[model samples]
Target: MIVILDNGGQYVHRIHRSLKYIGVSSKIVPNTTPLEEIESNKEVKGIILSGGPDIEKAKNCIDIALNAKLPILGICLGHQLIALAYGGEVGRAEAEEYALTKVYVDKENVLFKNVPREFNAWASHKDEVKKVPEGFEILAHSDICQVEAMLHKTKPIYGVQFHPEVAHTEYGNEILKNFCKVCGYKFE
Candidate 1:
């Protein structure tokens, strides 16, 4: 099962529903839940940080990003939190993407496996990661956003500026399926 850290927003419920559609069992928990308590759940195979309207309302996500050994996937606001944890710079986007944007993969890996290099993904954010973390590599990019998707050099961590949970994103289920694979959940 995957543990979803709810950061509060419209996307929280959709993310859980998306995982369920992918045939992956998941549970949603508030972001304030302590890392120790999350780690205590031996049944959890991965963690997903859901996006929120505001970043300041988010709590404990940065701590989890830095400390959790479990596989993690961050979306939108959650993605920015991961960037902040690893010394990357995140600020207000100049373009503020909120529509379908064409994305190009910069590096091919497990997280993006089976997902095409070019696809129209739905982005809804006013802030984005301006600089990538030291130990991370940007896996995807778009015309307005430099860091559309990113992953750690060795850790099973990833972040995306788009909302893959929503139906509007192309091949979103495939991306989430790939994440589930990273979590060691065996499936088609």
Candidate 2:
């Protein structure tokens, strides 16, 4: 089962619903839960860091997710938190993106496996990843955001600035399915 770490984002449940639609069992837990509690759950195959309003407050939870060593996917504020946790830089976006934006994948990555190189994704963020962490490769970008998506070079860690759980995001489910594959989930 995939564990969703709720960071109090408005779309947290939507992420859970999206995973369910993909035939993946999942549980939602508040970010305040102890890392030990989460790490001890053998049923968890992966973890998702749901976006929130503030990054500073969510830093500790991001720390727990990073050290969990499970396949992880971060969205929006979670995305920025990942960058910060890894010695990268994150700052306020030059212009907040609150609508559908065209994103272009410039590299091949598991998260974007069956997704097109270019597609419209629902973006809702005031902060963006300005610099990627060490050993992380930028997989996609948009005209406004230079780092729309990133992944660890040799690990199953990924961060996306867009809200793929939203229906406005084209091919969003495909992206989630790719993540489920990384988590060893099988849709029978």
Candidate 3:
């Protein structure tokens, strides 16, 4: 099962909906939930950190993202935190982003499987990743944000600045189903 770590993003519930539609079982858990409690759940194989207003508002995420071994996919604010957890930098966007943005896939992998080389994805954020973590590769980018999407070198971990669960992002469900594919591949 994939666990949706609630960071209080408005799109959080929609993530659960997408997973359900893709036939991937999941549960919504507060971001503050202890990692031990989460790992205790034998069904959890991956985690999706939902976007939020600010990274400072996140509780237990730094440790969970940093310490947990599960495959993680971070969106929006969660994206920033994932970078932070893996030794990257985050700060105010050169220009705050909102609404539709053109994302160019620099390198496609599990997170962007079957996604076009370039496509429009919904982005809403004030902060962006200043520097991508060393072990991860940039999966996609836009004119405004360089680290629009990322994935770890050898792990299923990912960070996407856009909201794939929203209606505006093209191939949104397909992107999410791709994440589910990773989640399912980790175990029997």
Candidate 4:
């Protein structure tokens, strides 16, 4: 099962919908749930952070990501939080605008398994991570956002700056499937 941590993103529910469509059971939880609680929870196999309308502000009120053994997939705001948790700086995009942007894969990333090398995706975010957490492996990019997607060098963690839950992304299910498979979470 997948536990999507809601960060108040407008499309948070879309993640759950996509999971159900992909034949996976999932639930939405507040990001306040301690990471340790998740690690010791009943039967959660994977955790996903939902894209939010505002992530930078969420930091002051909520706890940073707790260290977790479970795999984590962070959407837009969630992605920013992940970077901030790792001591990275986040700020408004230099060229802030929202629309479909072309994204390309930097290398073999589990989040994009079997996906085309390039694709257009919907994005809406003012703040972007100036730099990723230390040891983060950048996986994808676009003209405005240099760090579109990333993975921890030695952890089962992934973050994306785009909204994969939207129908605009034709092959989004494939990306989520790849993350669950490679992030060390074998959700049966």
Best by TM-score: 1
* Candidate 1 lDDT by residue in tens digits, 22-119: 78889999889988999998999999999887777775899999999899999998899999999998999865557998999888688778788899
Per-prediction TM-score to the true structure, in the order listed: 0.96, 0.95, 0.93, 0.89
Worst-scoring 10-residue span by lDDT in model 2 = 57-66
Error of 1 at 3 (Å): 0.8
Error of 2 at 84 (Å): 0.6
Candidate 4 segments whose C-alpha is farther than 4 A from its true place: 60-66, 94-97, 183-188
Whole-model lDDT values for every prediction? 0.89, 0.85, 0.84, 0.78
Model 1's lDDT to the true fold? 0.89
- Local accuracy of candidate 3 as per-residue lDDT tens digits, 4-27: 889987889899887777677889
TM-score of the candidate numbered 1? Answer: 0.96
User: Every model's Cα RMSD, please?
Assistant: 1.2, 1.3, 2.3, 2.5
